[model samples]
Target: QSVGDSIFPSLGQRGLDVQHYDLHLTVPRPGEPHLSGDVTLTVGAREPLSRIVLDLLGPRVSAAQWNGQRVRWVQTAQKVEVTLPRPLRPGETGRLRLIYAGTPELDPGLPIRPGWQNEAGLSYSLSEPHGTRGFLPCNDHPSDPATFTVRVTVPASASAAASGLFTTQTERNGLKTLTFTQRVPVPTYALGLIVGPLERRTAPDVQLGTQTVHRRDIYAAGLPAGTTVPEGETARMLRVLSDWFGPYPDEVYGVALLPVRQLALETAGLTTMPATSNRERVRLHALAHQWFGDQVTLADWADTWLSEGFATYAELLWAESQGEDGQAMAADWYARLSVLPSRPLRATREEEIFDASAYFRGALALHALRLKVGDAAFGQFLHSYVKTFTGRPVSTTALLTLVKTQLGAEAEQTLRVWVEGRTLPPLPEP
Candidate 1:
C-alpha cells in the first residue's frame, strides 16, 4: 500500500492515518551505530484493513504487538508489514507497537543519505525528503502530520535534543533520560534527534504579539571555546517573520549546532546547523521555515517550493528589514538564476525537488506576485495564508485559490505563470 505521492510513490502507507507517535530510544554510546527503539503509533484506519504497512529502512524489528497482544510481522529492506489478528473497520483506531534494535542504515541510491549520521563523537539524524524510515517506522510522507512524545536515554555524559519542547530529564545510575513532547502535528521529515556532549544555552525570550517564544541554542563540544551563538539575531529574525506571517506557531524556537560542515536543516522547533554554516543569512533562512515549511507544510514533495522558496525569499525579507532595497535583492536572485537552466517550480522529478529551481525560481515567483499585488496586499496575503493554514498541509493550488480571493485573479495569474511555466518567466518590473 502507498500514498501515491508523485515524487516517491512507495514512500507512505495507505488506509492509515497516524495520529501520534510515542517513541522511546536508548543510545548506549556516542559515535556508535547500534541503538534500541520501542515505538507505539496511534493509528486510525481509513478503510478496512488486516495488515498495516510502514516504511522502515534500517533498524531490524525484534518483536511486534497490536494493542498489547503480540502479532506476526515481517520486515524488508524498505518496510515493516504487521498482520492484525482481526481486521480493523473503517474509522477504527488502535495502537501498534514495535520493539527494534540495530544500527541505522542510509539509502545507497540517494545523492545524500540523510537518515542518521554519527562521527566525531556526535550523533544526529537528518531525514529530509525520505530518510525518516532509516531509524523509525512511519508513514514517511509530508501529508501525515502527527504529534510526538520522544523519550531518549543516553549515557550520563551525553545530552539529548529533539523536535519538541523540553519536558523532563532524569538520571539514574550511569544513564540519563531526556524527554520532549510535540503537541503540534509535524511531518515525519521535520522530526529531529541528536545526542552528544552538548552545551545548552538559553536566550532571552521573544515576545511576538500575544505569544512568547522561548529560545535556546545547543552547541557541540567540538566547537571552539567562546564561539558565539546568534541568539540576538535569531530573535530579530523571529520578530520580522512574525510581523510578516502571524505570530510564531511553535512554543519553543532554537538551533542545534553540529560539528560537521555543509549541514543545515529546518527540523521543526530545533533547526539543525553545522558549525561552518552559522551565518546570519543561513540562520534567518532556517528560522523563517518555522512559519513557511514547518508550520504551514507542503502537501506534496512536488510543491517543495512552498518550503524552500519561501525560506530563500526570507533572506531577502531580512535584508529589506535592515533598510536594504528589496528590488535590488530580488534582482540579484534573478541574475544568479539566469545562468542556470530554467526549470519549473512544480517539480517533475525527485532530483528537481531541491534543485536550484525550487529555491530561486520559487522565490522569484513570490517576488513576482508581490510586485503584482503591492507591498500592503502582499503582506496581508502572507499573514492570512499563514494564519489560515498554519497546521495543515498546503499545495500550490491552495495558495492560488487564496491569492484569487485576497489579491484578485491578476495576482493569481502572475503566480501561476511563474510557478507552472515551463521556462522562467520574466521578472515583473517594480
Candidate 2:
C-alpha cells in the first residue's frame, strides 16, 4: 500500500470486496508488546468471489473466520492467504477476528515510524504502507482502497491521532482506545496514526470566501507555540481546493505538526507536519496534496504524474504571487522537463515518471497546456478529470483517452508526446 504503485494503478481495481477495518494495538509483554485486531469485509452482490489476499507484518496470524464461521487461514511475511468457508456472492459480508501481536519493524537502514522512534522522549509518524503493515495486517496498497477505524492504546496519559474523525472513546482497564470512524473509501497508505503524550490545540474558525471552515484539530507532543508556523496556509489552500475538487469529497481537512526529521505526509483528511521551521513553501506544497494526492489520487504508478506533477505546479502557481512573471515560469518549467529521461504523464502502473527529470519536466508540460489550452478549457479538463473518475480506479489508457477526448485535437499530438509518449512536448506560447 505504501508503494507508488498503490497510488497509480495499471489494470484498475481488482477483487471487488471493500472492507471496514477495526484495529486495536495493545501491550502484550513487559519490556516488549505486540498488536492485535479484527476486520469486517463486505462485497457487492455482483462480485465473483473465491479468496482474499492481504499483507500481514507478523510471524503468524490465525482465528480467521468468514461470516462468523471458522475457516482455514494462511500467513506470511509479505502476504496472507484465506479461503471463505462458505460461498459468498456479490452482496455477502464476513467478520474475521484475528488476534496477533509483534514489535513492528521496517525495512533495513531507514528508521521505522509510527512506532516509538526514541526513548529519550521523542516520537514520530512512520505509517506509510511499509510501516503500517509491521504494526497491523492489511491490504497494503492504495490500489485497493479500504475504510478503517484504528484504536491504539498507549499509556493512559498518551494520546494518538488516526486517519478518521475522532468518535466515541472510553477507557478499559489501564488502557484506552482513541477510536475513530472513517466512512470514506481510502487507501491504506492514507491510513495513518501517531501516539505520544501530546499537547494538542483546536483552533477557531478561519474565514474564506462566503463560508467559514473550522481550523484543524492541531496536535503535537510536549511542543510549544510557534513550532509550526505559516498556520493560515493550510486553510487557505483548502479553501481554493474545495472549489477545485468540488467540496472536498469528504469531511475535515487535518494538519498535524509532530516531532520528526524531514518531509510531510497527506493522509485522507489528516496531514503530518514535523515540529520544524516555518518554511512557507513546504506548507503550501504539503497542503496542495489534499486535492492532487489525497483527493484525486493516483490509479497506478504511471499516472503518478497526475498527482506529483500537478501538485508541484500548484506550488509554482502560489510561488508566482511572490513576483515571478509568466515568461519566467515557462522558462523554469521547460528547463525542468528537459532533464527527465522520459516524461510519463500517461503511463501505466509500471511506467513511473520517477527519474529526476519526470517530476519537474512533467509539470512543465502540463503548465504549458495551462497556457496552450487557456484557463477555461484547462479548467474544464481539470474538473472532468476529477469528477469523472471520482471513485473509480485510474489507468494510463483511460487517462490518455480522457485527455484526447476532452482537451481536443489542438493538443492531440503535443500532449500525447509529452504525457503519453514520454517525449518533450512543444510549448504553447502564452
Candidate 3:
C-alpha cells in the first residue's frame, strides 16, 4: 500500500498511475473548518491489481465506487483501500470515486500545518510534501503527476483562485462555483486553491524570448488603499529567468497575495505570497520555481534539492543581473551555511529535506559545477537541462547522465561529489 519513498515510505502507493483528478468541493464559509467533497480519479494500472490503495487523512469517506459500481472500502488513519469488483490488468484504466465529507485536519510530522487552513475570513490550501492527503485522497506522491479539474463552491460573496487556467464561473441562489483546469500534469503538492473576499488585477503581458505570457495579481479586497503591487517586477523577473532557463513553461503566471505575512509557496502557475512580504529576492525565488520546481519536478522526496537548490540559486542569478558580483553572493551563502551541520543534498529523513543543506549547500554545489565547466558551458547545460526535462519527473541520476553527455566525465565528477558526499565540499575556485 506504499510507494516506499526513501523519506516517507508510507506516503504513496505503488503499481498505480493517476492520470487526472476531478474534484467537486463545497467549502464552508470563511472562518469555518468543514469541507465536503467528492473526488473522481482516473487511474491506470501499471501491473495487475485487485485492490487499490490511496493516501487520505482527516476526511471521512462515506461511499466509494469503482467503474460506476458500489464497492467495499476500508479507511485507516492514513490510507483508503478499495476492493475492485474485478482485477485490472496492465495498461487498464478506470474511474474511482470517493464520496467524503468532514473537517480537514493538519498532516502530522511536518514543520508547518499544511492542507486546508482558514484565518480571518480567508480559507485556502497550502499543501506541500504530504499534506494533500488532508483534504483529498489520491496517490499523494510526486512520482505520479496528473492533470486536474477543480470545481469549488463557496458563498456568493467570495472569490476563488486555483492552479492552472480559470475556465468558468456560475452563480445560483446564494452559492457560486468556480472551475479551473490544469492541463499540465502536476504533483499533488503543487495543487492550489483559495476562497475569500478577493479582487483580481491584470498585469501587463510579458514577452519572454519569443513567448508572451499572461499575468495577473489576486489580493484581498480589504487591503489598505495604495498597497504596492509588484506586477512590473514580476514581469521583469519572468523575462530574466526565461532567458536563462528556456521559455516559461505555462500559458499564465501570477501571484496571489495572502492577507497574512511569512506564508509563501510556489504553487504551480500561481505563486502565493503575503501582502507585506513582497521583497524582490523572495518574489524572484518563488518565480524561479516556475521553471525548476513546477515545470520540472523531482521523482522522490529524497531528491528535494532538485527544486529548492535551483530556486535558491536563481536568486543569485537575479542579483548578478543587477550588477552584483556572482562569486560574492556564492561566498555569502557559504559563510551563512558554515555553522550548520554538513549533510549531503540527498535527504535521508523528512526534516532534512528543507534544511540549510537542501537550500544553501545545494546552490553552492551548482556554483561548483559552473566554476569547473566555465560560464559558457554551464549556461548551455542549464538551458539544455530545462529543455530536456520540462514537463517530466527527474532524479539526480538523470542529471548526472546529462552532465556526462554535455560536459564530459570531469564535470559530472565535480557534481557527484558535491551532491552525494557525506561532508560538504569546498566551493571550486574559478
Q: Tell me the TM-score of each prediction against the true structure.
A: 0.95, 0.83, 0.94
Q: Give the alpha carbon lDDT tens digit for every residue of 271-362 in model 1.
A: 88887777788888888888888888877889999999998988988899989988898888888888888877878888788888888899
**Which residue pairs in candidate 1 have backbone atoms (N, alpha carbon, C) closer than 3 angstroms, thus clashing?**
none
lDDT of 2: 0.59
Error of 1 at 44 (Å): 2.1
What TM-score does candidate 2 reach?
Answer: 0.83
Worst 10 residues of 3 by lDDT: 222-231
lDDT of 3 at 171: 97
Q: Write the per-residue lDDT of candidate 2 for residues 296-376, one digit (tens) a residue.
A: 655565566666666666666666545657567667667655665554565433334444444565567667667768777
Count residue pairs with overlapping backbones in model 3: 0
For lDDT, candidate 1 versus 2, the one ahead is 1
Best by TM-score: 1
Using lDDT as the measure, the top candidate is 1
- Relative to the true structure, candidate 3 reaches a TM of 0.94
Clashing residue pairs, backbone N/CA/C < 3 A, model 3: none
Estimate the Cα RMSD of every predicted model relative to the unseen true structure.
1.8, 4.3, 2.0
- Candidate ordering by lDDT (highest first): 1, 3, 2
Worst 10 residues of 2 by lDDT: 107-116
1 or 3, greater by lDDT: 1
